[PDB]
Ligand SMILES: CC(C)[C@@H](OC(=O)[C@@H](NC(=O)CCC[C@H](N)C(=O)O)[C@@H](C)S)C(=O)O
């Protein structure tokens with residue numbers, strides 16, 4: 001059998017308030033988790049995840065093939081050359097099980113300066129017809145802001161954990177320009193399940209998605225209650241238990257870069273499970289021009305031998321690298 005990963009539940013509610021000592025006690029827990037397996041569950045986060053799950057189910061189960069083509073990213077529909085990130089990512093029956101819908105900052109409107117400039121990684125979201133999916137767009141945009149709020153609170157905790165003032169990361173995470181995305185992923189129950197959608201790891205584990213580090217500052221993830229994730233530790237791959245009341249948090253490779261690998265981006269993978277389930281990540285991305293000077297909290301003078309990297313450069317290159325390594329989702 002596989003051992004269970006140490007993934008503590010951390011009450012993050014103090015990060016929304018003004019009790020500075022209580023915030024430090026949360027920051028310590030974040031520090032400990034970040035230095036151990038790299039994962040923790042945020043609890044007492046204030047988001048109605050049951051409703052998120054319900055609204056997402058209604059969307060995934062009602063969208064039709066016609067609509068999926070009309071919303072498809074360029075990888076599936078050559079007519080949509082402006083859709084690299086935002087839109088529908090189709091399943092391929094008999095070959096690829098997973099399907100998903102990605103959306104970006106609702107403030108990326110046609111008149112936004114970065115949209116006007118055609119800056120890479122910025123796009124205007126695409127949405128299904130309101131009459132076919134009543135309330136969906138409004139729900140989804142509001143969810144973006146609810147999880148943005150949680151994420152800003154978590155970033156205050158990571159900053160305090162690293163010995164910085166609480167706005168160290170959050171000052172770069174702004175509603176007008178964040179490159180953060182929500183992805184609503186459907187992992188289906190299929191009978192029979194196509195073997196081509198099942199990968200096998202070197203250790204023999206059947207997978208839906210291979211090992212990787214995240215392209216993010218941090219990742220803020222809701223999943224259904226079906227165990228699927230594993231994290232690589234010194235003791236090998238360990239199972240991360242599901243908790244459909246909490247958000248699973250981990251660092252991405254931009255955090256690892258900034259901290260000189262003090263807070264590593266944990267390597268993780270997704271086991272194959274033949275169950276109808278949801279994986280709904282929010283990738284906490286900064287602005288296109290955001291640069292945080294790398295440091296090293298294990299060094300007395302705090303200095304690191306890494307060169308500064310703008311977030312936009314990091315992101316554009318990382319999203320491409322993911323596709324090249326683990327395939328187009
Ligand atoms: C493991 C889960 C978290 C989830 O995987 C992802 O969400 C993957 N994410 C992506 O493929 C990047 C999507 C980027 C998005 N299209 C964007 O433009 O921002 C992993 C590499 S983290 C899952 O498979 O359950």
Ligand SMILES: [Fe+2]
Nearest residue numbers: 212213214268
């Ligand atoms: Fe990931």
